[PDB]
Symmetry: D2
């Protein structure tokens, strides 16, 4: 017979729950040890950046209750990119919290079809669809409870990959936080791709965009990409990379993969 | 860690491809031996009723080419209900054929979210989302190439279950074909369901709707439900049931399941 | 040349703003003197039923601020039907309040295309489109802050017309409020309508549905339909009709219009 | 009372119908004398670029019948930008022809909400919503009947403005046709726009994109923008501009308007 449908299987560390880890005075890591889900607590509600796997919806709500954040207090959901391992529980979180989802046009159309018809993965990695409530332009500022979030487009991993920057505090003194999406091309066809003709040009420009980001502290959807280690608690950001080191190491791998593809 | 995502696993007979089996002068079974996918060839294009599993998209196009039906000749896609085992390849068939999808409001909203947030199954059975192009009302007539299709609402299995009736020919003499959805409640909570408060009333009315259907030849999305056997070719409709026998046997099981639920 | 686009022109009384008029301990009329927009204040947020004309968005927010209801306190928007003169400002209210919209499948698909492609009016009466966040079934209960709202389907005016019932208080003693949609067919083709084949059957059943509604106090999207007069303030409900009188008078006009159509 | 809704009123020349005007061996102007609606007839169907005002749906179908193009022969609809005066009848054309709509993400999200919530015009200019069937990336090639269409992004007038280029013939000898969107900012706030923070950068890059377009014959959604005159028939392209002259004149006006805004 025809082959059975195969689901998205990941490592066991991507689904290992952890307690809320503090990043700044209002920024908390409430995801897992290998998936970043940031919670920003303001005076007029909470903001969530990414969510992880689709089955992490209940775990995210439990950590929000640990921080004193009721479900109806979640006001907005921000996304780096609309893939299943980071925008999975968005649909379920909208129903159980009443929040809104902000994303650009490319992330909105990919989120609306549940990651299906992917430019590189096809229908292999899908998740429940969700609709975006506010369309975001490049450089637009989103304000929730006095905390301003600025969107920075960085197409490559997905056409709608977006980096979010905001200024928090660390016991009074300010700190610039940058949450940038992945800059990798896992198994992508880089040259002459019919679905993404200008893929190389968007990666090169995104490398420069990440370098110029105002950032004192960098975080990525996968903690290992920015040399974070959520398991060691207080010393999690000890070896974290800079925006230059994160972009320089990404461009060196992109050039090597682009060279091997030629051969 | 959290449990891995589990996909929809079915029997091997649901994915066993078969050659186009003739039902009438213009009606053909082009699905598998355990999944019904009807092809109606007209003078101004072709019409497809249901599709089966999501991975059956390539198999459906091959049988259409066997009948001399080009991809651009598929004009319309009709659906009984928007579940994965029967509306799976709808999204892929729209891209590769340029056809339109007609469905009622309940089937359109379930198809738009890929079967997720199901009233009884939740997110356990999902598929790539698709958007309906024409909304159909109860009793509305859809005409393609002189062949009139009449929609008959029969809510129960899904809130938007629809039966389609049309008149074909069998070597000149006419024949009334009825394609009715399933009348079963597999594992449903029948009494006091918060997601479907009037589930019992819709099943009772749907039982009467199927009995009154103008039908000389009955077909169901699952061939065993109407006692069809696609494997024996010409003698496939030898033991096929009537609309009364199909509805009477469905209501007897519904009453028994409703009685066991009380206990 | 071709004719210019003509907009939806209404009477001056439909756009005459008024102060919040109290209906019960938690129910307030915050629309205009000829358009009903109900505000239900609970302990965990506010609920809005209908909105009126699209340009009434600013007026609705001002009356909510008069009641001490911040924009972020609006939690849910309920709709009777998705026409421009009652679901107009829904799209703008979602952006400026962060609320969610609950509606059935028929109201959701009509709201998603902004009232265009109407079964009887075509594209003559349009408004900014909005997407529903929660799909509601017949008889489903929606709870906000301890106040339960029950949806009652009554198709006719639109295929997704819904009546909402809830129990409030009047200085301690309870009162059953029923917000039923219009039961009129203004200029509709009642017999043999291709877009709505079973229009007569849905009107007859909706007449009986309104009679059986649990109701001590009836309100309609147009106040004159239920003999309300918002201009006289405290004596607004003095001449209000019952559910029987409202349905009996509607069925008598429907039979007369159906008889004149035959001629 | 509140102000009445005001519709989109245009000049009488935008609604002045005209007969099919030939541009190349397969390219025809089937719109009006002041609105461009291009019809490309291939061996495997027809392609339509833009449509004009919403009320021009019937006029477009009549000219298609004059060219021997049946409604079911229209295979694809391409859009320059999703404004009412050029994407108006898209929703009605989809229902009456069965065609598909191809657009980028920005044009798809603006077309899905009927031009409402415009970045500069708000809800002042709306039209019936339509859904895109295929999402197009920058530089992607769309092939219909052996004629290849290449999309060139040129954001500015709208965030999803797209220029389409294709090679036709003029009695055997080939000719490169370029259909570029408007490069004007009518009444836009150019500096410090919250809804479009990087508006100036997108206009500057779009000016350079239009200059480098492979083009022997340039056409614009408004004929006067490229110095076309559909009224004089055969001598319509006598004074048509080049891509350089069209972009140079657009950048000179943009710099002047940007200078006056500073004052």
């Amino acid at each position: 017979p025809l082959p059975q449908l195969r689901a998205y299987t990941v490592d066991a560390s991507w689904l290992q729950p952890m307690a809320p880890l503090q990043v700044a005075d209002h920024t908390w890591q409430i995801g897992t040890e290998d998936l970043t889900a940031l919670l920003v607590q303001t005076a007029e509600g909470a903001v969530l950046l990414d969510g992880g796997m689709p089955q992490m919806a209940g775990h995210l709500l439990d950590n929000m209750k640990l921080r004193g954040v009721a479900p109806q207090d979640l006001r907005l959901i921000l996304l780096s990119h609309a893939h299943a391992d980071h925008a999975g529980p968005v649909a379920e979180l909208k129903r159980r919290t009443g929040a809104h989802v902000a994303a650009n046009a490319e992330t909105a159309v990919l989120l609306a079809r549940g990651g299906s018809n992917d430019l590189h993965f096809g229908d292999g990695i899908t998740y429940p669809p969700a609709s975006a409530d506010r369309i975001i332009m490049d450089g637009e500022v989103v304000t929730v409870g006095g905390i301003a979030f600025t969107a920075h487009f960085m197409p490559g991993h997905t056409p709608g990959s977006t980096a979010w920057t905001w200024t928090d505090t660390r016991d009074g003194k300010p700190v610039r936080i940058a949450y940038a999406d992945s800059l990798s091309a896992p198994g992508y066809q880089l040259k002459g791709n019919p679905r993404y003709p200008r893929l190389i040009e968007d990666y090169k420009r995104s490398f420069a965009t990440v370098r110029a980001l105002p950032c004192d502290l960098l975080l990525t959807p996968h903690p290992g990409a920015s040399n974070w280690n959520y398991a060691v608690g207080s010393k999690a950001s000890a070896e974290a990379l800079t925006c230059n080191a994160y972009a320089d190491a990404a461009e060196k791998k992109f050039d090597a993969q682009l060279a091997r593809e030629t051969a």
